[model samples]
Target: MSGTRPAARRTNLTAAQNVVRSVDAEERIAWVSKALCRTTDPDELFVRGAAQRKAAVICRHCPVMQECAADALDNKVEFGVWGGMTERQRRALLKQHPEVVSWSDYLEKRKRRTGTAGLEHHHHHH
Candidate 1:
């Protein structure tokens, strides 16, 4: 019996502007060429269970791991492994932070926060 249409709220319209700043497809292709998974079977990346873990291991040492992961997260990709994270892991992260507009920026901030803040002054021996 509800007849009232919800009014569209534009309170944070500016916040949605920068969310579309995704990377170019050419750049993705260039980096993917150097990814460790290039040599592995493509099906391995999509398989679940122990095999998916193996695929993730390949991503661990990939030079473009960050790019791959950021792209997947930003695009809300629903399949396969990227940047060492399985589909379940990606889903969990997305569910945990639904408000994250740019996963790359988010990851960078988290990295800086958890990095070795006090360990920079340990090499003072001359």
Candidate 2:
């Protein structure tokens, strides 16, 4: 938690860790893939909540839990469940506390506070 801040209000999603099970080897990519490609409304799609629990169970046995977490925080993953929860829940959790939406946002704020170059916009002078 050294890299994280105390709880506070947040405007974007948080970089949380996986709390649910992962898909089976055969269903791994297929599961996340379905999440990415499914056109059904997410709020309604999870009615059974079976997948949620299943994901949690699988994630508990996964060897890449930390890796998935690292990717979630670093990439600001916007779709599916990077940290075991749905995107909607992810947004809700962040709304309830202060967290880094993504690493870029964190870096930008850091640079601003220290007066450093966070953005390097490319342009040409005529």
Candidate 3:
């Protein structure tokens, strides 16, 4: 044995990471509302397993970022950058607060925590 552990180390990748399922109509905000909607290399927006700073930059001031993040979490998005966060970040967040898998759930939690819906700082860019 060369100091290698069991297969459990390799199992950290979730099952959702391997399967590529089509996004449903409701999850299509990522398609139309993305800041990189016109990027020539669309794959750059969804760099699975890696940090996409440029993609996050684009999503920073997007109109549908909340919706996109909600959809990504709701769909269990296996790979890609959605709502300005990478897959790794999303996975960590999900692990921390598994109950926040839905937008309403997240919002309700935020509301209870801050005494409001937490939309007081919305930056409207038109």
Candidate 4:
């Protein structure tokens, strides 16, 4: 809810996030959901941190990744990237659509300029 939109290309797994590519989707969801859903703060869950990682993972496998992202901006879902995406991915898609960029650019820029420093600012974990 408070950070700048993620860049379009947050690809290549981080060493910490190189989770084994499991064939068992259910098992992956069980773990990924709990890990990402530990927070109640929408910003922490939807805008950054582990939630973004989960979204990134899911997005990679999405058949309709582009369309899903389009719907999110059109509908203003304002949460986890439905269909499959992270805030960063969504931001990238929006970048291609400059009109959409204007919708969030101001708030994201303000947060960057005025927010506190050095605080990872963990999302509100429930």
Best-to-worst ranking by TM-score: 1, 4, 2, 3
Candidate 2 per-residue lDDT, tens place, 20-98, comes to 3454543443334444554433343443355654343332333544455565566444343343343444466556755
Off by over 4 Å in 1: 1-92, 115-126
All models, RMSD in angstroms: 23.9, 23.9, 22.6, 26.3
Worst ten-residue run, lDDT, model 1?
A: 77-86
For all predicted structures, in order, the TM-scores are 0.17, 0.16, 0.15, 0.16
The sequence of per-residue lDDT tens digits that candidate 1 reaches over residues 1-126 is 775887777686565322222555434433344545555444434433344554464554445444555655674333432333434444566677653557535544654454444675663557
Q: Which candidate tops TM-score?
A: 1
Which residue runs of candidate 3 sit more than 4 Å off their true CA positions? Answer: 1-84, 99-126
Query: Which candidate leads in lDDT?
Result: 4
lDDT comparison, 2 vs 3, better candidate: 3
Q: Is candidate 1 or candidate 2 better by lDDT?
A: 1
The per-prediction tally of clashing pairs is 0, 10, 0, 1
How are the candidates ranked when ordered by lDDT, highest leading? 4, 1, 3, 2
Please, what are the lDDT tens digits per residue for candidate 3 over residues 6-103? Answer: 45567566666243237554344334435644553435355432665555445444455445556556744324423334344455566675533483
Report the lDDT of model 4 for residue 83. 28
